[PDB]
Paper text:
Among the eight groups of insect chitinases, group I chitinases have been enzymatically well characterized and have been shown to function in a chitin-degradation process that is closely associated with insect moulting. Our previous work reported on the group I insect chitinase OfChtI (previously called OfCht5) from Ostrinia furnacalis, a species of moth that is the most destructive insect affecting corn production.
To investigate the substrate-binding mode, three proteins, OfChtI-CAD and its E148Q and E148A mutants (referred to in the following as E148Q and E148A, respectively), were crystallized by either co-crystallization or soaking with substrates. Fortunately, the crystal structure of E148A complexed with (GlcNAc)2 was obtained at a resolution of 2.2 Å after six months. The structure is similar to that of wild-type OfChtI-CAD, with an r.m.s. deviation of 0.16 Å based on the superimposition of 383 corresponding Cα atoms. The significant chitinase–substrate contacts are localized in subsites −1 and −2 as well as a number of amino-acid residues in OfChtI-CAD that contribute to the binding of (GlcNAc)2. The pyranose ring of the −1 sugar stacks with the side chain of Trp372 via hydrophobic interaction. The O1 and O6 atoms form hydrogen bonds to the side chains of Tyr217 and Asp218/Tyr272/Arg274, respectively. The O6 atom of the −2 sugar forms a hydrogen bond to the main-chain amides of Trp107 and Ala108. A notable difference when compared with wild-type OfChtI-CAD is that the side chain of Phe309 in E148A–(GlcNAc)2 rotates approximately 90° to stack with the acetamido group of the −2 sugar.
Author numbering: 24 to 406
């Protein structure tokens, strides 16, 4: 009854060489819930925005994805609306009035019917966030959107699920999330327990520490997976609605000039924007798990690998490059911790960044860990 929630990135198909990851690459049997990311919302009409129509519609992306249920009928296939790149202003605008929300709700219902999805994952980052085009009113109005979507899903009579991806920082919760009301309307809360540290913070650190470290101060004090999930509980979310996010990627940094200190919290060249891009994801500031393991785990690697004893995460560095991530050791620790706490399951961002090619050894090694622990686990009643 535990969940293994797999976010699937529709843009991963454009990665060159062995990075190429399409619908056919999804290890469907390792997941209980798979989420096609992303669709968006239009600025002008508050309707569903199809972001890559040539892929999603013309090449039958949406339907290829949902058709996987023929061979795997136990698995739920949903779609996610939003994501970071979509921005927050169009969503704040969409929820501002009852009329615009109902327009979106209708559009959503038509879309889900048309492409045979099992429901919707909400990925607005974030209601109430001034840095994301949000405002104070978003908190009530996001709740209204959620209530209105749930009611529409009920009226359709197909048992569609409604879920949401959420942050764990307290200030974000206060600004955007009516926790008890949201958790009762949603089938699951996909907690984004990653990107907790990164170039934007001005220092090198792992981005999904499980527990507090000594250098964690002020806003960062409780910004860890354990305390963050505890925060969701304290604000009124039942343990059996909480799904814990696991990143299949690392956050990278370029260290400051002449800096020979590689410890957690060391100063960085923030203007660099992060570590140098890797060959497949091609982005400053992060590496896919498979880009990390092919560099760090080879026999003749010049990388130095270390372990965060409190956060329970690996980090590795070479020259000016520093990357914090998750490996099988750290993932295993989180799986056991999930079961100990009694949470609903594990989520990954994102399945397309696992070592699906087995470049480093075993294919799909990280998702195999999630599946192994969750499939043998019974979620206890709410605490
Ligand atoms: C709701 C939310 O904040 N979703 C986050 C993701 O958007 C984000 O992944 C990022 O998605 C972008 C598209 O919206 C991509 O442009 C970007 O490359 C991608 N970044 C990574 C590292 O995959 C992830 C991770 O930052 O957090 C999600 O929960
Ligand atoms: C969908 O499946 C068809 C038939 O195998 C394939 O030709 C097409 O490329 C697939 N589309 C996507 C987006 O994966
Ligand atoms: C890779 O990303 C960089 C950003 O630094 C961009 O300039 C370049 O066009 C990208 N290359 C490919 C082949 O995607």
């Amino acid at each position: 009854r535990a969940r293994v929630v797999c976010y699937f990135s529709n843009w991963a198909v454009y990665r060159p060489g062995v990075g190429r990851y399409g619908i056919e690459d999804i290890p469907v049997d390792m997941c209980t819930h798979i989420i096609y990311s992303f669709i968006g919302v239009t600025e002008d009409t508050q309707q569903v925005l199809i972001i890559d129509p040539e892929l999603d519609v013309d090449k039958n992306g949406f339907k290829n994805f949902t058709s996987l249920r023929s061979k795997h009928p136990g698995v739920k296939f949903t779609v996610a609306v939003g994501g970071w790149a979509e921005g927050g202003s169009k969503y704040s605008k969409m929820v501002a009035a009852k009329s615009t929300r109902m327009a979106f709700v209708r559009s959503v219902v038509d879309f889900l019917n048309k492409y045979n999805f099992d429901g919707l994952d909400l990925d607005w980052a974030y209601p109430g966030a001034a840095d994301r085009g949000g405002s104070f009113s978003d908190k009530d109005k996001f709740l209204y959107l959620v209530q209105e979507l749930r009611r529409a899903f009920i009226r359709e009579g197909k048992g569609w699920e409604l879920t949401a991806a959420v942050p764990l920082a307290n200030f974000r919760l206060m600004e955007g999330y009516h926790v008890p009301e949201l958790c009762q309307e949603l089938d699951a809360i996909h907690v984004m327990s990653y990107d907790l540290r990164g170039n934007w913070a001005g220092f090198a650190d792992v981005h999904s520490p499980l527990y507090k470290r000594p250098h964690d101060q002020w806003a960062y004090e409780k910004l860890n997976v354990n305390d963050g999930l505890q925060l969701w509980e304290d604000k009124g979310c039942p343990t059996n609605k909480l799904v814990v996010g696991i990143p299949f990627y690392g956050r990278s940094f370029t260290l400051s000039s002449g800096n020979n200190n590689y410890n957690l919290g060391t100063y960085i060249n923030k203007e660099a924007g992060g570590g140098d891009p890797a060959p497949y994801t091609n982005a400053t500031g992060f590496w896919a798990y498979y880009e990390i393991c092919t560099e760090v785990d080879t026999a003749d690697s010049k990388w130095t690998k270390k372990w965060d004893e409190h956060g329970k995460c690996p980090y590795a560095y070479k020259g000016t490059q520093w990357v914090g991530y998750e490996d099988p050791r750290s993932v295993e620790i989180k799986m056991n911790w999930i079961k100990e706490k009694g949470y609903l399951g594990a989520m990954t961002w994102a399945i397309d960044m696992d070592d699906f090619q087995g470049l480093c050894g075993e294919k799909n090694i990280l998702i195999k860990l999630l599946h192994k622990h969750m499939s043998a686990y019974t979620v206890p009643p709410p605490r």
